[PDB]
Amino acid sequence: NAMEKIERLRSAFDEAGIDGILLTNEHSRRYMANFTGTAGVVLISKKRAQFITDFRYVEQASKQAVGYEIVQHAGLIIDEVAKQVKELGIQKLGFEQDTLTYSSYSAHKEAIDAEFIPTSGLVEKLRLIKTDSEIKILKEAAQIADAAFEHILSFIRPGVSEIEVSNELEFFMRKQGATSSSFDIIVASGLRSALPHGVASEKVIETGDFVTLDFGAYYKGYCSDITRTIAVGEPSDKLKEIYNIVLEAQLRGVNGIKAGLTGREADALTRDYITEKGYGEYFGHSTGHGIGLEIHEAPGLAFRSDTVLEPGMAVTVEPGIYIPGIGGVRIEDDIIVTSEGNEVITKSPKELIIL
């Protein structure tokens, strides 16, 4: 079945206008070759498949990169790639333009005899649909994030700082087996709760604060991503008002997302309600995006998206309202798209919790 991914990638070649592909992106390398290491490249023709790397990694590669010829280069990877392009008969070699640096582009082009053709999206098409094994891991990563939410509720009080909360979330997910958090944790309290991207700061949490907690677990190479907004003591009617709207919009999203909607449709489940209630101006981001090896990947549940959702897509549903000078709320779940609806894999409570 590393066999089968290679076969499915090869099926894309003619459309892309290539007879081979050079994969340099770490996520593509990990995805196609199950290589967890730091170095090396994958070179795949219509007929052969190679993992090229340095002396250090040869043992690891030979064990993980099952389905690949393990090729060891004697110092200069580009020179080895060029050697193998000629051995594989490749005449029109694809590369990943959205990762490959201009420098490495020039170096490769000079060295290699074939046409060197920019490509985008090839391994991404394969990663879009999660296998059952990937689903199991993502469920585990969500479980660890849920455990940390339940944990952190006994930690947040007035006088603790936002970074302190971020540090305890990081500590607890690791204790439960996460490699680490899956992105720079957001703990955004009081007026900062109006900042959708409010990475934890030195600010001290005070009574009356809404606190948005946006974090996830990086577990066996996969990412979860949960957001919950709690209150520390009694929140304002206006903050309560916004919370209720976000919650309701979010449930409409989870309840209505299914295979066959476009990204625009999926986003409209949440944005229709927030807009109807008069806060469209204040929902300045999309309803969500894909998650897997990366914290943000295809598809986009966004008003511009025409992408049709299919089973096995893993995505976030995360509407919010942000009013500068007042505060904000976001509530985010992770789901797996199914034929009929979806599966919510983040199960922490979404009701307003006052601490």
| Residue list, annotated binding site | 214, 225, 318, 332
Residue range at the interface with Ca ion (CB under 5 A); choices 66-74, 221-229, 246-254, 261-269: 221-229
Q: Nearer to Ca ion by C-beta: 85 or 329?
A: 329
Number of Cβ atoms within 10 Å of the Cβ of 129:
14
Residue range at the interface with Ca ion (CB under 5 A); choices 89-97, 112-120, 217-225, 264-272: 217-225
Does position 333 interact with Ca ion (CB under 5 A)? The reply is: no
* DSSP symbol at 57: G
Return binding residues for Ca(2+). 214, 225, 318, 332
Residue range at the interface with Ca ion (CB under 5 A); choices 100-108, 145-153, 218-226, 236-244: 218-226
Shortest approach of Ca ion to residue 162 CB, angstroms? 16
Q: Nearer to Ca ion by C-beta: 124 or 225?
A: 225
Residue range at the interface with Ca ion (CB under 5 A); choices 11-19, 63-71, 219-227, 239-247: 219-227
- Determine whether 231 is exposed, middle or buried from the number of CB atoms within 10 Å of its CB (0-12, 13-18, 19+): buried
Q: Nearer to Ca ion by C-beta: 25 or 287?
A: 287
Query: Are the CB atoms for 124 and 137 separated by under 8 Å?
Result: no
* DSSP symbol at 309: P
Q: Partners of 297 in the beta sheet?
A: 290
Between the CA of residue 203 and those of 64, 304, 353, what are the distances in Å?
45, 36, 21
Shortest approach of Ca ion to residue 216 CB, angstroms? 7
Shortest approach of Ca ion to residue 226 CB, angstroms? 8
Where would I find the beta strands (DSSP E) of the chain? 20-23, 41-45, 49-53, 69-72, 92-96, 115-119, 180-181, 186-189, 210-215, 217-219, 222-223, 226-231, 288-290, 297-301, 314-317, 320-323, 327-330, 333-337, 342-344
Shortest approach of Ca ion to residue 336 CB, angstroms? 17
CA dihedral 309, 311, 316, 321 (to 10 degrees): 50
**Nearest position to Ca ion, beta carbon:** 214
Report how far residue 4's alpha carbon sits from residue 335's, in angstroms, rounded to the nearest whole number.
26
Residues 6+ apart with CB under 8 A from 133: none
Does position 214 interact with Ca ion (CB under 5 A)? The reply is: yes
Q: Nearer to Ca ion by C-beta: 96 or 225?
A: 225
Report how far residue 13's alpha carbon sits from residue 15's, in angstroms, rounded to the nearest whole number.
5
Q: Nearer to Ca ion by C-beta: 140 or 225?
A: 225
Q: Nearer to Ca ion by C-beta: 287 or 342?
A: 287
Residue 26 CA neighbour count, 13 Å, CB half: 7
Shortest approach of Ca ion to residue 142 CB, angstroms? 13
Q: Nearer to Ca ion by C-beta: 80 or 214?
A: 214
Shortest approach of Ca ion to residue 100 CB, angstroms? 28
Residue range at the interface with Ca ion (CB under 5 A); choices 27-35, 95-103, 169-177, 223-231: 223-231
Backbone angles phi, psi at 116, to 5 degrees: -120, 110
The interface mask with Ca ion, positions 167-206, x = CB under 5 A, is: ----------------------------------------
Shortest approach of Ca ion to residue 249 CB, angstroms? 16
Report how far residue 263's alpha carbon sits from residue 30's, in angstroms, rounded to the nearest whole number.
27
Binding residues for Ca ion, total number by CB under 5 A: 2
Q: Nearer to Ca ion by C-beta: 89 or 349?
A: 349
Report how far residue 237's alpha carbon sits from residue 57's, in angstroms, rounded to the nearest whole number.
59
> Could you list the residues that contact Ca ion (CB under 5 A)?
214, 225
